[PDB]
Design a protein around this ligand. Structure first.
Ligand SMILES: COc1cccc(-c2cccc([C@]3(C)CC(=O)N(C)C(N)=N3)c2)c1
Ligand SMILES: COc1cccc(-c2cccc([C@]3(C)CC(=O)N(C)C(N)=N3)c2)c1
Lengths: 389, 390
């Protein structure tokens, strides 16, 4: 019920990613690696890059094995490309094991590495179905479970500070915990509620109802999951399908109407600032996402505060004002429950029982009047119909 | 053909430079001078060097004037040092005028002069902003325009042979034309299309779209001009910013995938050879660069063939094979539309109207199936956003 060695093993923030220390090769080469539930490749910088101060040097590892195969991962105006191989991998603040795992050695990239993120690679924690070049490239977690006795589960506690962390602060601050092979009860309060993993590719889930300050968004529930809904620690925002996004922004604007904000704010592009300590949290609504339960015709809900969906950012003038960006944005690839949502909760990726658990996080940001919540059950019918085909 | 006295006044090739004959001093001293749109100094060898068979002898010129100032010019590879002065300068196959111009007399150099290039100096045709030591040293063309009635424009037709030229052939062959003060209609076909000169320092332009065999490279257009894009007759290759180069090479490899080439070829280091006459031009893609037009929201494109981007080179075994080097390479200083690109086109440097014109060259190398092209217009929005800002 406690995994002391793994508690507080994460660093980072929602805007740039949460990462864990890993070692690759013999002798071990230490790297900081993005914890990414939204992808399935273990890919590390393996050549000089202006944003990297270290990278994987294959020629210095006696245990390096060349798979003699390339891998190309393009995004919309950007990419990563590399060379496949295998090597011995360990997680210093993880299970006391060493695994032989696939590694994509990144040789070229465009708009991939982030200046000041402090990470040099990515740990794709999702399933083989979405691994590149194809599903035959076993993901890291699959190798870890196959080669050791580590239980087939991991849990994430991502801790948003609630205020901007400068360069030195973010390197010194504890950003959360990745518990590998278990659940640590000190990381959450209340009960854990589980939603089924719909299909094993991304960590896909089904949203059955959406509320803004208890008011039903009242859309056909298939809209909420068009074309899928996923839990992604590697996405900053809560991202919503176009139609859902438009309806949600209209409702959030209506609820917060006592103050008017420029359109650039609602586009997640420009910041909004208030005098130190005067952020008007109470004018912004809570957002409730109802998820399919494990029991027939039953759902539960997770409730998010503006302390989660308003992302703290430093002002251009580095003033004493408290500034934020709107961390809800449009998607054309379905709902994405990103880092800003995960920061409210302790999230259990129970691969063994094909389900994801949510509980209120012991590190979520709130105020004296409202708290994030995980509650249930609720009677909900035809929930399978909310899934898109 | 309105400028017969200037037509065919160039010699040289893309690998070593195109040069024009000039005279300096009184009595005139003849020198061959690199035509360089990528720099702004008129600099000539003025002391013995192993690769020079002649140089400027200031002590023999009655019109020489010493400016009593030194100049130090380092490049990526190579550098030179000189002594500044002025003298009377003429272009025998040029306008029939004589002008007093600044001259940097090169007294010391390292990896600057090229063995067998046949040129003894450089004619920097770009703007004062990039002149050395600073912008107060008036460039040659500025002096020419100020002192005479020559219109503020020049045009270049660089003629690539399409095959290697030995030492004897390169000296006897016509390498192209530099028309000073005008546009000669015999040097091009079709229409001239103009792109704005973004800023007067280098001949800076803005590329708004890139295609490989009609397939959009699909990069943010700012990437194509990061940190600038220039037209440089003094650069051999088409040079592209790192990310653009990586994307272009991947696409060129994919288009030419029926034949595999070693990594050294794509690095522009090693040659590739085919049996005489069998170069598989058709497997290589055409490359289109769209440039900002003179009209709002309008662009045009220039299309080049592998006959431009594959530079003919003599085989190591001087065999009968047709050999080439890949003449596209990476840059950390922005896009450079070098000589191999300019060989496809007649290029008008319209300084008076702050614009550069392109038209299909009457001397471009092609095959029976494809030709280089200059076409337009194309509707293109937010082109100003393609320009880079520090
Ligand atoms: C909160 O997590 C992040 C914050 C900023 C950037 C990234 C990030 C950077 C580069 C690649 C990824 C990626 C592999 C690809 C991607 O687009 N997503 C959404 C993802 N989950 N992982 C993330 C993660
Ligand atoms: C096609 O033009 C050339 C081919 C080979 C070499 C040169 C050349 C040699 C020495 C200096 C220059 C220079 C003055 C400096 C430079 O690096 N570039 C790119 C330039 N435009 N002119 C060119 C020109």
């Amino acid at each position: 019920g406690s995994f002391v060695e793994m508690v507080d093993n994460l660093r980072g923030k929602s805007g740039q990613g949460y990462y864990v220390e890993m070692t690759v090769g013999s002798p071990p080469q230490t790297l900081n690696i993005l914890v990414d539930t939204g992808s399935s490749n273990f890919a590390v910088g393996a050549a000089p890059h202006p944003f990297l101060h270290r990278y994987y040097q294959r020629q210095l590892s006696s245990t390096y094995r060349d798979l003699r195969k390339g891998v190309y991962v393009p995004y919309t105006q950007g990419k990563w490309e590399g060379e496949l191989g295998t090597d011995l991998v360990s997680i210093p603040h993880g299970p006391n094991v060493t695994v032989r795992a696939n590694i994509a050695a990144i040789t070229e990239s465009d708009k991939f590495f982030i200046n000041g993120s402090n990470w040099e690679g990515i740990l794709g924690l999702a399933y083989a179905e979405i691994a590149r070049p194809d599903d035959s490239l076993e993901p890291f977690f699959d190798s870890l479970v196959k080669q050791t006795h580590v239980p087939n589960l991991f849990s994430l506690q991502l801790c948003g500070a609630g205020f901007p962390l400068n360069q030195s602060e973010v390197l010194a601050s504890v950003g959360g915990s990745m518990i590998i092979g278990g659940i640590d009860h000190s990381l959450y309060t209340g009960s854990l509620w589980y939603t089924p993993i719909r299909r094993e590719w991304y960590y896909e889930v089904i949203i059955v109802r959406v509320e803004i300050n208890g008011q039903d968004l009242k859309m056909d529930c298939k809209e909420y999951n068009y074309d899928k809904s996923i839990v992604d620690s590697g996405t900053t925002n809560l991202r919503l399908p176009k139609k859902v996004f438009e309806a949600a922004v209209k409702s959030i604007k209506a609820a917060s109407s006592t103050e008017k904000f420029p359109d650039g704010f609602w586009l997640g592009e420009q910041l909004v600032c208030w005098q130190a300590g005067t952020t008007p949290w109470n004018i912004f609504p809570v957002i409730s996402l109802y998820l399919m339960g494990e029991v027939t015709n039953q759902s539960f809900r997770i409730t998010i505060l503006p302390q989660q969906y308003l992302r703290p950012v430093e002002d251009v003038a580095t003033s004493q004002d408290d500034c934020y960006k709107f961390a809800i944005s449009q998607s054309s690839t379905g709902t994405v429950m990103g880092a800003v949502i995960m920061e409210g909760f302790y999230v259990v990726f129970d691969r063994a029982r094909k389900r994801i658990g949510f509980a209120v996080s012991a590190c979520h940001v709130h105020d004296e009047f409202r708290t994030a919540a995980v509650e249930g059950p609720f009677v909900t019918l035809d929930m399978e119909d909310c899934g898109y085909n």
